[PDB]
Structures are given as C-alpha cells and as structure tokens.
Symmetry: D2
Subunit: 470 residues, 4 copies
C-alpha cells in the first residue's frame, strides 16, 4: 500500500547518490517492518545541471513523472512517501504548492522526509556556476544549473515566495507527515580552503542546519506615525510545527559520512539516517507523529551538545573547532508604494538603550546579500553567544532592528525615508531561520508638486517645504 | 454646480513656468470677454520637480493630489471641477493621478477636462539616450537634466507606462462627464536638430515625442499560443478620444513650441490657443462628438500640407518627407509566468507571409527597453506599408513571427516553438500605437524528471525523450 | 620550388570551406602553370570556435604547425604562399608580425593572397556569440570564440595595434607579394531579417569592402595651444594589391568567393583566375602590373554592380550599391587616458558646418570593450558628389568636444577641437583617426598659501590653467 | 642665506584647512625659538580638491607643481628647499609629483624633507567601499563624498598604485639629499566606528589606513613560471625609509587624530609634533639613519603597549587584541601580456607545503580589486603566523599555489599549469615582514595545444576536430 520515491539534490549525475538506502527499505519491508510491495521503491532522477531549467519546471516534470509510472496505483489508493536530499526537498515542496496548496488532504503524498534541505538557501549558491563547480563537491568545471542556483541563493525572491506561501500549510492536520533530518559535521577532507563556507560552523559543508528547519516565523514591521509619533507595528506568524532532528556526525555528501550517501547494507542498522528514515516512515497517526517530534528534538540537543568541541590532530598541527547553535535572518525591506528598497543600512541593537554597539562579542558569523534582488539580506549569527550575553540583568534580554533607508532626511530631501527602530526580545530561535519584512513609509515633500494662481512666470524651485504629503 | 477652474501642468526638465508661454494670461482675458466661465484667480500654474533622481512619477502624481487639495479643496467641495492643460510629461502625470485616486469612479473625479499637449503617452525614444547626454541636447538647453526615474517612465517599452496604459483600456471618460483631448504637432524646429542624434529630427515626431505615441486611441492584442501549434488572437481598444495634429508646431521653443510659442498677440491665430479654447467649451457628448470629427479633419489637413518640406540655403538644398507612421510595443512572456529576454521577432507580408516580402521603406526605427530587454518598440511608415501590402499580389496581409529561444533541438529539455500570427488589413492604424503581448507555451521534456523502480544505480542521462510534459 | 597553405575563416568546422581550389592548384601546377610539387599543397585548420583560444594563440600555433610539417622544405629554400579567407588573413598578418616584424627578408612567406579578410573588423562581430551562431549560413546557436569576436569587432584595440604596426611594413621591397581580393555581392537567401548588416551595401554579407583593403592612412590630430589649436600628421601604408571581384559573396556554394569554386567552373571563376595570377607574380614589375589590373577590375565590377533589380512574383525591388569609406576614431589626451564621453562631428561646406550631403551616412558603431573607439561607415560617392561643388568648395573637417566641457564649475575638462581639410577619405578605404586632446586642469585643483588661519576649501575655478 | 620652507598637504575628504590641527602655528613659533630655521611666511597650507569626480591623482600632482611654482618660484631659485608634511592621500600625491618631475634626478628636486603621517601608500580597504557608502561614515562627518578617481587610486591593489610604488623601487632618497619619513599610528577612535563597515575599526589600522599600507620599506616579488614545472624568483626592495608607529593616535579627529588632535597646549607632549620636529632637523646621512633607529624603537614599544585594550562600560566588558600584520598584493600575468583574472591562490605552510596547514588565525581580510579583477590583496597577522610557522613541526615553511584557468583538462587547447613556490619565514630571506606590505607578481606559462592549428597535404576535405593533442606549442 506504500510507495516510496527518492529525490536527490543538485549537481547530481548518478543515482548512487542515494547510497544503498533504497535497497535497505525494500529489504526491511520484506521483514515486516514496512508495507512496501516489491517494485514500489522508485529512484528519482532529475536534471539539475541545465542552465535553461528552472525549479518550477522540474516540479512540473516531477508531476508528469508521478502520474506516468504510478497513476494506476494512486487510483487504487496507495499514496507515496518522499525521501529527498538537498534540492529534492525544495523541489517537492514547490510541486505540492503548484498542485495542492489548498487541498493537501487530496495530495497523493503521505510522508515527506527531507534530508539536509536548503529550504532557506545555501550560502555557496552565490559563488556562481563556475567558481562553485570547481569545488570537488560538484566537480566538472561548471556544474549546476544557473536557475537552480538563483533559487538557492540566500535572500532569493522565489525562496521567499514558496516559504511565505508555506506559512499557511497544515500538513499534519491533512494526513501529511513531513520531517527534516540534517547533520552539522564537516567532512574535513573536502574543505576548500579559499571558500570558507565549506567548513562553516553550523553547516554540513553545504547547507546551514538553520536553513533546513521548517519551523520559522515571518515578522512584518510596518512604519507608522504621520510626522510623529507611533512608528512601528509588528505582526508575526509561524509555520505549523514540523518534526526536526539534527542527527549526530553526518555531513552533506560523500561515502564516508554523507547523510544519505554513506548508507550501506552493512551499516544501515546503525546509521542514524537509516534508523530515523524508517521511524518516520512508520508514522500513521497524529499522536505517533507528535511523539516522534519530541524524540527528534531530544536527539538534536544531544548531537549539538556532543559535537560542540572537536580536537583533530595530525603529525603537523593541532586544532580545536567550536560548533555552537546558530540562527538566520532573511531581511526584506519594502515601502508603502511598491518599491523594493535596495539602498539601506541595517543594525542589530541591544542594551538598556538599544544601541548598535552593544551586542555581545562574537554574535556575528556571516552577512550575505542576494545578487539578483540586491535589497535582500541574510545574516548568519551565533544564537548561543547572543542569548548568553543578551539575557543578563543589565542587558535585560534586549534585541532590536534599526533600518536606515536611503535617501535619508535632509534639508534638501524631496522623497526619503525615516529611521525605523524596533525593540523586542521572540524573534530568534536555535537552529532556526527568520524572515523579517520591513515596510517603510516613503515620504514625499509638498514641493514635488505645487500650484499657484500667480500667473507671473517664475522659476521652479527645488526648495523643500519640510512638510510631507498625505 | 457651476464655474471652471484651470490648472496648467508642464513637462520634463522644466524649471520655469514660462514653459506655458502666455496661454494662462490669454485664457484669463478670454474668460473676461465672456468666451469662458473662469473667475479671476481660478487659473493656476502647476510646478513640479522633474529633475530629481529620487522622485518617481507616482511621487509627482501623489504630490499633485496634495497640491490640489492644499489650494482648492474648498472650491471643489462647492461643486467646482477643474480642467488640466498639460504639456509633455504633465499628461502622463495627470493620467496616473486619475488611476491612483479615481479609476473605478471617474464620475466624480474633480477633473472635468483633460487637454493633452504633445504627451509621450506611449514613451519618448529620447529617454533611452540617458540623463547626461540628454541634458546637453538642444531640446533640454532650457532646463536641467531629467530625473532618472522620470526617464525610466518615458522609455519606450517601459513597464510603468505599459501598466498605466493597459489600465486605461478600461477607462471611459466621456460617459463619466470627463472630456479628454490629445493635441500635438509634427514639425521639426530644424534650428534645434541635434547632429549626432537623429531622433531630434525624426519624421513623424515633433523633435521629442512621436505623433503615434501621443495618441490615446490605441489597442491591445494578446496573442496566446495553443497546441500542432495554434494562435488565439484577442484585441481590445480604448474609448474614442479627441485627437488633433495642428499645423507647423514643434514640441518646445519660443518659435513654434506647441504652447511655448503662444503670445497675447498671436493667440487669436495660434492653432493651440484656438483649439484649446474650443475644447474647454465642450459640455456634452454631442459637442464632444462634433469636436472629434472637426479635430480629425484638422489632422488630415495638417498631415496633407506637411507631407513635404523644402529647405534651401546658400549652402545646400534639402527635401524632408514626413508621412504618417505607426508604432508597436511588444511584450513576450510564457504560460508559466516568466518574462522572456531572448527572441527574434518578424513582421510578415505576402501570400502566406514571408519575413522578406515587406515593402521597401516600411521601417523607421526599433528600440529595446533597457530595464526590460523583452520589450520591443518598432516604429514604421504606415503609408509605405499600406501602400504596398493592399495590392492584388499582396492581398493586404500582415502578421507576426516570433522565434524565442531556447528553441526545439536534440538539446531540448526546455524550449519554445515558433509562433505565426496571420492577420490584418486590423493591427496597424495611422498615428496609432498598438500593444502586442504574446504569450508563449513553455515546453519541458520528460527527462527533466523521471522515476524508475530499478534500484540498480545508474548514470543520469540528460537526453530528452522528445515528448513534452503537461 | 613553391609551397601553398590555405587558411580558413571563423566558425569553420570542415575543410570544404576551401571549395575545390586546392585540387585546382595541384592540377594547374601539373599542367605547367605553377611550379608546385605534388604534396606541397596544404590545408590549414585552426580552431576559431573556442572561447578560451585567442588570435594570438592561433598565430603562435600557425608557426608551430608550419615548423612541424615543412621545417625540412623551408631550410631547403622553398618558401610558401598563403591563401587566406576571412579571419585567416588577419591571423597570418599577426603571425607575420610576431616572428618577422623587423626582417621580412627572412620570412618563409613569399605570397599572401587574402580573400575577404576583415582586416579592419566586421560589423557582425558586435552582434555577439549567440546571435551570430544563429545565422543560417554559419548556424549552430552560439559558435565563434568571444576572443575572436573581440579581435573582429570594429574598432577593437588589438586590430588597431596590429595595423599601426603595419604602417611600418613594406613587403614588396622585401620580396614578399601581398594581395587582397574581395567581393561586394549579397547572397540574398542568407539575408537575416533581424540583422540588416547581412545585406549591407558595400559588403559581401559579412565584411565591408573598405575593411579588407590594406591601403589605409593613420591620420593623427594633436590639439595644441587660449587658441592656436590643431596639428595634423598623416602616415600611410605602402601600396598593396587590392581587387574587388565580380559577383562573389562571403561564403556559400552558390557565390562564395572561394566556397563556390569547383573543378568545372574554376576557369571562369574570378577568384581562381586571379589567385593563379597572384601566384605567378615574381618581381616588382609583375606586382605593379597586377596591381593596376586589379584596379581596372575593381572599377569595372563596381560600375556593373551599381544597380541590381531583384524580381519576384510578390515584389520587384531595386538595390543600389555605391563605394563606401570607413573612419575609425581613437580619442585620448596628453596624459594617456582614453576618452569615452564626447561628441564627434563630420563638418563640410565653406564654413565647415557640421550641419552641412544628404545620404552621407550608412552606419555607426561603438566598440563594447573600448568605449572611445568610434567607427563610421559612409557613402563616398554621395559624399564626394555633394562637397566637391562650387558652393561647398570640397571642404571636409572634424569637430570633437570631450566631457567635461569648459564649465562654470569645471576643474578638469577639455577644449573644443576643429580640424579643417580635404585628403582623409578615399573609396574602398579605411582611415584611422587618432585625436590627442589637451587635458586642461584649473589651478583651484591645488593652491598653497602662507595665511595660516584655517579656512574652508572652495572648489570654484580660477579661470586659469596649469602647465 | 635661506631658511627652510614647509608645505602641508591634506588627505581626501578635506573641506577645511583646520584638518592640519594647529601644527602650522607650532612650527612657526618653534622656528621663532631657534629650533627650526623657518622665516615668517615660509610655512604654507596646501589645499587640493579631493571631492571632484572629474579630478584624478595625476591632475592633483600636476596642479601641485603649478601651485609651488606660483607661490615660491624665486625663493626656490635663490637656493631654498621646502619640507612636505602630508596626511592620508597627500602622501601618495607628492610621491606621484616627484615621480612626474624628478624620477631620476632627486639631487635636483626642490624638496628637502617629506614627512607623511597616514599615507595610504598601498591603499585603504575603505576605498573599495564606493564613494556613496564612504561619505556616510561618521569619521569624515565634516567632509563630503570623495571623487571617484581618488578612490580608484586608493583601492587596494589598484593598477596605478602598483605602478607608482613599483617605480619607487629604484629611488634612493637619502643618497640624493632627500630625507623621507613615514610616521603613522594604530589607535582606533572607538567613538566613530561604523558598525555596518567593520574596516573602520580594523585591528592593524588607525580607522582608515592599515599599518602595513603606510610603510615604504617593501619588496617586489616576481615568480616566473619556467620549464618544458619550476619557479624562478627575483626579489627587489626599496631603500630604508624612516618608519614610525606612534602611540595612541588615530587617523583624524580632534580627539586623537594623528595631526587633527594637535593643539599648541598639547604640542610639546604630542608624539607627532615631537617626531616631526626631529625629522625636520635631519641634515645628514648620519642623523637620518639614527633617527630611523629611534623610530624603530618607538614602533616597537607602541605595539607592545597597544597589544591589549580593555573598554569597560556599565553595559558590557570587551577586550581588543591588536598584533602586527603584513599585506600581500598579488598581481597575476602570463608570458603573453594577458592579465590572469580567473584563478585561485593558496598560501601553504608546514612540511610538504599544504594549503590546509596554515596557522589558525593567520587570516584577517582579503579583497579583490574592482577595476582589475586579477589583483588580490591579502591581510594577514604576522605574529600568529610567525608563531605557528617558526616552530619545529612546521620547519619555518611558507609557499604559494596558484591554479589559473582554464586548467589542464581534456578541454586543453589553451590552458595553464599549476605553480608551486616554496620558501620564507626563515628570518634570512623571508617574504613577510611585520608592519609591511609585499608585492607579488605571478607570471604563468600560457600553454596552447598543437590542435589550435594544423596543416596537412591530404587535400580530401574532412571535419575539423577540436580534440587536444595533449602536446604544447613553443
Ligand atoms: N567564499 C566563501 O566561502 C565565503 C566565506 C565567508 C563569507 N562569504 C561571503 O559570501 C559572499 C561572496 O563570497 P566571496 O568569496 O566572493 O567574497 P570575497 O570578498 O571573500 O572575495 C571577493 C572575490 O575575490 C576572490 N578571492 C578571494 N580569495 C581568493 C583567493 N585566495 N584566490 C583567488 N581568488 C580569491 C573571490 O573568489 C571573489 O571573486 C561575500 O559576502 C562574502 O563576504 C563567502
Ligand atoms: N564592509 C566592511 O567593513 C568589510 C569588512 C571586512 C571585509 N570586507 C570585505 O570588503 C569587501 C567589500 O566590502 P562589503 O561590505 O561591500 O562586502 P560584504 O560581503 O560584507 O557585503 C556585500 C554587500 O551587502 C551590503 N550589506 C551587508 N550588510 C549590510 C547591512 N547590515 N546593512 C545594509 N547593507 C549591508 C553591503 O553594503 C554590500 O553591498 C568584501 O570582500 C568583503 O568581504 C568588508
Ligand atoms: N579541513 C577543514 O575542515 C579546515 C577548516 C578550517 C580551516 N582549515 C585550515 O586551517 C588553516 C587555518 O585556517 P583558519 O581556521 O585559521 O581560518 P579559515 O579557514 O576560516 O580561513 C579564513 C579566510 O582565509 C581563506 N583561506 C583559508 N585557508 C587558505 C589557504 N591555505 N590559502 C589561501 N586562503 C585560505 C579562507 O577561504 C577565509 O576567507 C587553513 O589552512 C585552513 O585551510 C581547515
């Protein structure tokens, strides 16, 4: 009654990317642990190395591939589970959005198990097609498709569109049980030295675990107050809870410790991914699901506690690597007129007074700005260093945002924005991404247009009246 | 329930209200003699900022609303309505202001008349030349360089002018007690022909804006591909509006500026002053109809007399041929929502429409928009087109052929197929622009995603099936 | 006692680009009309469709291929003749410049016959790699190397550099006999409706007649000086054989200048005819008589091809092809900078009015990598006809103004230059026009004062200039 | 029969001559007390335009010569020479001036002393930050946005910076009676730190210029790829110049600006006033060489006292570590004249020269020039590196590895070969010196395969194969 479909990631050119997990599940079903008839396990192959192919298209082609091989079985009423890796995750989420956003109860997918999904993007996607194809994790010279890489770029418009659309989902309430499994171990033998993201703390060498999590909040900040005063009003929303687990000592790819690539028949019984793939596949109820959620999070705590400090030693060097728990902000800033702000300055603030110079030492990990939509900003931060120094008596747990959009207020300004200030701290969570959309009031001065019945001609002064228009 | 207000609106790079010539002084006196009902002090000079890089057209239209309320909110509340006499970009400004504030209830927009002097309603070919290069041109000597965002508005094939004009397809000013008129000229002030820029003397233009781009009588043909490839044509058209081409008038200049060259002494004989007075005297649909025919007659008289111009000097003899012209603005997208940038576009003619059968001399110019490279503005010679195509061996045919890439090939995976629209005398009209939005069928090959239950790992072939997906 | 090597053009993937001319030169030699041993005819094949391969690469490679195959025969005192087509011409010209610039008496090349070389560039190159590859004749969809396009875009730095070096050449005096043979016929099937250059008058569909000629002048105008102003300096290459053959396009089996040559039509093919004559030249006299005969063929061809009437059951059209002139402008200043923002004017008439003949202009192009290189394409006949009249006194000049202009605030600017002359233009010829502007800096850019009381720094110009 | 003349020239962003603090009046009164021989009226305040986009550094140098000739022509004719005291970009400008008029006859240059305070001789990391972002920085609150041509010059690894400073390799200021000096500081004025641009508080700088960029004791390093892969290296170095890292001084600001904070009430105890007065008194090869010995001593003590700073407010406690750093400026060309832009560069250390063996914390910052993509400037911590490399297990080794593209592959036709260079932190002939910039020019051997051109006398037409021969052409 159960069908299983594997979906790989980008820059994949061989179906052994799935390791030996497919054979395992078929072999496990033969022993009564799964109800998968012979021939109901499918290996998915899709073309991710084409510059002309967008993400939507592959989601359209996935639909065509599903109806093609198993329309008869879906008519009988079987439903399938999705075990994806890397881009496969976002692809299937798009396919669901393209075909079942508002009738998920009638979607033929029964389970969706995502392995290290770049649900909120990969920092390396901005590196390009050629500079990143050189990294042996892809290899060829110029590997993955440009349009796939536009999607995965941090602060991507399409990424925001699909994830804000997914804010409304309720998979559990509709009989769809989704999960996310990821690791935070760097396969240090493949660290590209002149591309630090490959050994970034908080990642498996490719995707940051905070980008894997499907538990995230959208925070909308609207500027108000006429010419003073009131200013910012906040409204926050959150996805439905999803089973989230950071498993121990598993990187993104590679036979050695690849989250899926490292699965063999011999080690499947003790492979964290193999073990938990199955337990998720076994879910058939709401209580079973929620018991798996509270089990997975417990593991997440354990692995991130056990992988906090690492001492690797060669005959040449001695090194300690610190891996904490992290967070991610995707900032979008628009205005009340439809323009997308691209020129601005954004500050995190803290202290009794919400000063931009007060955040604890070491709060920052990385700042990236999207190439196509420049006005999108993705910050990568150390939640543990922050929360540690944030939550004290004389800092009071404060954290805020200050956007200085441009052009700024001046004695000659005619269309400009004002300083926006927000004071809070719950915005950030460990191993979580946050989407902050900040809407500013575009302020046009009355001088931009004036009328006077003084019919004696005169020069048109660019003299601002210092008074805004309604 | 009685009285008339008049508000003048100038054009771009205007820094002095003498841009309006002496037309305000004239109308005040004409109303004093009983030819209009305009109380003393109800004629207004508008002055807005067009030389600011930060100020948008939306900004100015919004600022116009505040300027109106700021000065004549009381009178409007008394049941008074104003007539906007606009010049150049002032027209696009006022149209945008009706769209922002009163589209779906024009019946009580405070505007009763809109007389539009030489407005780049469908853009100005000069805009793409740039800010610095244009400020140095003889058409811009009288002011400062133009705003970057204003220039983004008047660029041929611009998105904003497209958005505004498609919205104006649904307008109906006449039925709502709003009488709009467009008046322009087609004479080149040859003393201001920029040498290294032919647009400043382009036939069918007044040195700045093309006659066809001033007309508000335009169509929108949406051509959708279906499929053996098929095409479905659907066209709509604006409501009839008064349109006049007056004799021997340029865009600006004290010599023959359509409004700039109006003095107290020459107003009685000035074509602009005469017909502006007539237009303001309309208070009925029948009066509107009568003016429509009378104005069209002036267009045919004007374009008959100005067909040839003989310039002789002690140094050279020259003949200038100004005919009647047509304009297209092509938009090209696909059925998945993407906006296409790479395509080849053909006009067709003959028995079954060869791209090489067009009459010699059909072409005047084409321009590709800088921000949307998929927007194509063609400028053609309707006389020569119609003259050759409406013959027995030509059978009065015309069509479009679009070749968008990636094209069909063994490289397929993702591509488009040719479109052939087969039509016409109608698509073209003299002194008229037409918007041709063509929706393509994006085809995806099935190997873009396939699933197979053969658990034996294998390489992933990028070879298309030759069969598209749904 | 002679070797022949064929060199092809860009986007060529098959040796048949040379038509059947190679077998024709082997048979003509066997009949006693040339002294070529059997096996001394060579087909050169170089890669032009690789984005990473440069013209410098291909030249360096030509030398290695020559040495790899005929080092034996070259030391035995044989020397070879190169018959080039399209970009193959510039390639040999570059090789020539890499290994035998200072001593053409020791170069193994004895003859160079160039078939429609875009020696001064091709207007098509700017169209891009993708757009050009879609032209059915060369069809593929993205084809030629981008570095090849960089060399062959009008006004490119490299072709400019190679050809400035060529004002110092004199192949004939060094025993080397050079030739340019081209046509001006449009193969009208290959006309691309979205790219009008494909039928441009004054071209063979790809190369303009004035772009293949090696008879050009490099005119240098140095603005000196409140006033005083212009100084002119013109240098010109040594004479070369230039022939415009009848009824031949760039490529295609129908009327390709070399591609349409067959075993059966070679005797009447204008190319095969004059290729044999060019190879038979062996002295100053043979070269000079050949030169003038090509001049007669050029005037005969261009007089018969002035008007062409094409006929179809759907339309009847008339094609007028005149003789055209190309100017290539280079604009720098007395400091080494390359000027990008400026307006350029042709001026004519008694007062040299930039506003003064109708139809003078055909095309203008701005190079994509060097923004300051401006290429004119002009109708010489219409030009000469309108200016060499009583009321226009045959005058022709330039005017340039680089930005910043002299302004109320300008501190680093340029002064208008005005050249008066006319010989700059000749039909079927390109002229390279380098203009050195005088960069003027106002003193306010730097002042010193012993008034030690601090004060704000005003940037208002003093109205004076620094040395 | 003369006295000396002194001319101040400021840096970029300067709209007011108070940028020089009160140093000029101090030098006037100090001369009045017999400590200098400056006649009244022989001290000049220079003002050049740094905020105009149309104005290049070459135009500033040109204008300086005209200004000097406009004001003190007959003074210089009568046998007088002037001392230059510069701050920020004024340093390079004068250096550009000397190069335009006296490159190879410094014995005939009217300048007798050059005292540069915070010259971005090798550029400022802030220059890459466009002239719009940079005018928003609170430091130059009083100043307006730069001219773009000054930025292009100040940008790290700019071609024009490489040219002037490469021409300065053959200078010998001391041997021609010209006494030049570099006196900088490394204090961060923590009050004006722009939190959106961390360079403004970068360790190893004063807020604008890194200590490695000020110094004129630098080396040019050439690595020529040879073989039929072997490397041949040629190192060249400038003549010793006075170098001083003075204590507790930032770039600008009346609080602790190296020159902006100078008043007459604090001049007697201002390190910059003390040492400038000493430089101006140099009148021999002897006094000069012993003045640089003194500056080396102060440079040392300054960086030992400023290694650790602790700022304590009621809200937070912080500790800032500042060590000694070195700047590598990479230029990459090939033997054909082309400029290699696409490549990757690995510093390698330890036995067997592994890229993955560099000492932890070796790196501070990397920047790729905007106008010339082939220029790579690395900013490195010398102490952490020298500490980790000059140990038994590391054998004191440091090398370079550049790959260059296209690389060796089945593509081939025109490609490049791996360059492996080995040497350094030995203290005998090392490549990195503390508080120093090093210039590294990398020439790769462009390799073309024989398939790019073949000839054959088999006259039967055939398809042309782009299949690489795997063998190269000379
Ligand atoms: N590359 C990474 O792994 C990484 C790490 C941290 C942050 N980021 C951030 O991602 C964004 C893009 O990364 P980026 O590397 O292009 O920015 P960058 O500032 O680090 O480098 C800019 C350019 O210089 C190149 N370059 C840097 N070091 C080089 C070296 N040793 N050899 C050859 N080329 C070298 C880079 O490839 C890039 O083209 C930036 O915001 C950056 O701060 C990237
Ligand atoms: N800006 C600095 O102080 C700094 C510090 C260290 C290294 N660098 C290096 O200098 C080079 C260029 O500097 P960069 O800052 O442009 O590179 P970057 O990678 O840090 O940022 C790239 C773009 O994102 C913008 N941006 C980043 N954070 C922002 C924020 N909070 N608010 C508004 N805009 C923000 C930046 O202005 C920039 O346009 C890079 O190689 C970079 O790695 C810069
Ligand atoms: N195998 C791994 O997992 C791993 C992880 C981190 C660092 N390392 C290695 O440890 C050593 C110390 O690095 P770190 O942790 O102090 O800082 P880092 O590795 O985070 O590097 C900091 C910056 O310098 C770049 N860089 C790193 N190594 C380089 C090299 N050999 N050559 C040129 N650029 C390089 C990086 O891309 C980054 O921009 C490096 O050799 C580094 O390659 C290895």
């Amino acid at each position: 009654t159960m069908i299983v479909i594997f979906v790989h990631g980008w820059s994949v050119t061989h179906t052994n990317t799935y390791g030996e997990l497919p054979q395992w599940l078929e072999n496990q079903s033969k022993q009564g642990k799964l109800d998968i008839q012979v021939g109901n396990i499918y290996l998915g192959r899709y073309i991710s190395f084409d510059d002309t192919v967008t993400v939507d298209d592959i989601a359209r082609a996935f639909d065509q591939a599903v109806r093609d091989e198993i329309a008869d079985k879906l008519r009988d009423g079987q439903r399938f589970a999705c075990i994806t890796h890397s881009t496969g995750g976002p692809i299937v989420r798009k396919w669901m959005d393209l075909y079942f956003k508002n009738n998920l109860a009638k979607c033929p997918l029964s389970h969706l198990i995502m392995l290290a999904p770049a649900n909120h993007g990969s920092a390396l996607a901005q590196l390009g097609k050629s500079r990143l194809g050189r990294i042996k994790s892809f290899f060829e010279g110029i590997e993955p498709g440009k349009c796939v890489l536009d999607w995965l770029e941090l602060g991507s418009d399409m990424s925001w569109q699909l994830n804000e659309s997914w804010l409304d989902y309720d998979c559990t309430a509709n009989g769809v049980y989704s999960f996310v499994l990821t690791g935070q171990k760097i396969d240090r033998q493949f660290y590209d030295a002149v591309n630090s993201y490959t050994g970034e703390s908080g990642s498996n060498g490719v995707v940051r675990v905070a980008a894997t999590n499907m538990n995230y909040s959208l925070l909308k900040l609207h500027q108000e107050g006429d010419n003073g005063e009131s200013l910012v009003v906040a409204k926050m929303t959150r996805t439905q809870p999803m089973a989230f687990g950071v498993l121990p000592g598993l990187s993104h790819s590679g036979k050695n410790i690849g989250i899926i690539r490292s699965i063999t028949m011999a080690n499947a019984a003790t492979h964290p991914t193999a073990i938990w793939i199955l337990r998720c596949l076994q879910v058939k109820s709401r209580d079973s699901y929620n018991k798996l959620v509270k089990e997975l999070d417990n593991i997440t705590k354990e692995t991130q506690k056990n992988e906090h400090k690492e001492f690797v030693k060669t005959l040449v060097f001695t090194r300690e690597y610190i891996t904490n728990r992290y967070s991610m902000i995707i900032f979008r800033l628009i205005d009340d007129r439809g323009n997308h702000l691209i020129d601005y300055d954004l500050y995190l603030t803290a202290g009794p007074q919400y000063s931009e110079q007060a955040l604890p030492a070491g709060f920052f990990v990385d700042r990236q700005r999207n190439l196509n939509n420049r006005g999108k900003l993705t910050y990568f931060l150390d939640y543990d260093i922050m929360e540690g120094g944030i939550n004290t008596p004389k800092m009071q747990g404060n954290l805020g945002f200050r956007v200085k959009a441009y052009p700024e207020s001046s004695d000659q300004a005619l269309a400009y924005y004002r300083l926006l200030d927000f004071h809070s701290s719950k915005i950030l969570h460990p191993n979580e991404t946050v989407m902050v959309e900040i809407m500013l009031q575009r302020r046009v001065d009355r001088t931009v247009f004036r009328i006077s019945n003084n019919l004696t001609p005169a020069k048109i002064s660019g003299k601002p009246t210092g008074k805004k228009i309604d």
